[PDB]
Design a binder for these strands. Structure first.
Ligand SMILES: [K+]
Ligand SMILES: [Mg+2]
Ligand SMILES: [Mg+2]
Length: 186
RNA sequence: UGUCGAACGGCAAGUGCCCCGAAGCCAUCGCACGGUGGUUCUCGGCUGAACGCCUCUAAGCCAGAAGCCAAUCCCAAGACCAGAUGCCCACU
């Protein structure tokens, strides 16, 4: 076993990270994010003066050590979301039948996917904002915006996964809703 | 057909036989009715290390089978209900 294993992250000036009982909360401009990591059993320290977030594993094997970088990446993702946010752009690609997507408040309705008469409905949580880009700029583009990367994604995936071609060749019939660009909003 | 003398009333033929027949019973031979959530498989994904990259996983996640579990439905306290009540009586 390894007596000490560390992972250190640098906290920007705007954001403040607070840890208490393996419960991380990152608060800055644009919002506040919270993660529960009580299943991990690591030593999480925050140096406010030096703006550092350290995660330590004492007497750990490879399996416990593998969680240090995962925790560091999670905290980095929350810092990035609190600072600049996350924006996922998905595009409706089709060969013959146009895929008509209507976006109400937190509601997405997909119609005429491969000519089907069934309407696909998706409810988006209030923490993720869904919009539709007007066709003059880019055709059939839906934008998901939010602080949580794990919440901005998943929504873009429940939209991709609901429009799946069934009982047909997937080399042919390439139509669907695909995530094209992942970026930020600020 | 027999038989009370005939008619009437019947009667015997272990319900004499034939036709129609209520009520009841009964026929996919008639008619009515036959519901809802979860947890998950397989799978496909998300975020993400190990392993500066990668990766559905490894810690987490998301979806998700006529399986499975509950609801509904049938029996139900030896499931010993200090559930609630109506009257007496005992105690008081
Ligand atoms: K008859
Ligand atoms: Mg007779
Ligand atoms: Mg006689």
């Amino acid at each position: 076993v390894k007596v000490k294993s560390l992972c250190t992250l640098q906290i920007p000036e705007g954001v403040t990270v607070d840890v208490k009982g393996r419960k991380v909360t990152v608060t800055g401009k644009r919002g506040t994010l919270t993660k529960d990591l009580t299943h991990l059993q690591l030593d999480l320290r925050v140096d406010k003066k030096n703006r550092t977030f350290t995660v330590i594993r004492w007497f750990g094997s490879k399996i416990p050590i593998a969680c240090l970088n995962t925790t560091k990446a999670h905290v980095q993702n929350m810092i990035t979301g609190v600072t600049k946010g996350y924006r996922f752009k998905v595009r409706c690609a089709y060969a013959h039948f146009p895929i008509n997507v209507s976006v109400d408040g937190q509601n997405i309705e997909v119609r005429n996917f491969l000519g089907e008469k069934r309407v696909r409905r998706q409810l988006v949580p209030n923490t993720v904002k869904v919009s539709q880009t007007d066709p003059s700029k880019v055709k059939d583009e839906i934008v998901f915006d939010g602080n949580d990367l794990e919440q901005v994604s998943r929504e873009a995936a429940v939209l991709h996964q609901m429009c799946l071609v069934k009982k047909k060749d997937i080399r042919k019939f390439l139509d669907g809703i695909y995530v094209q660009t992942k970026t930020n909003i600020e």
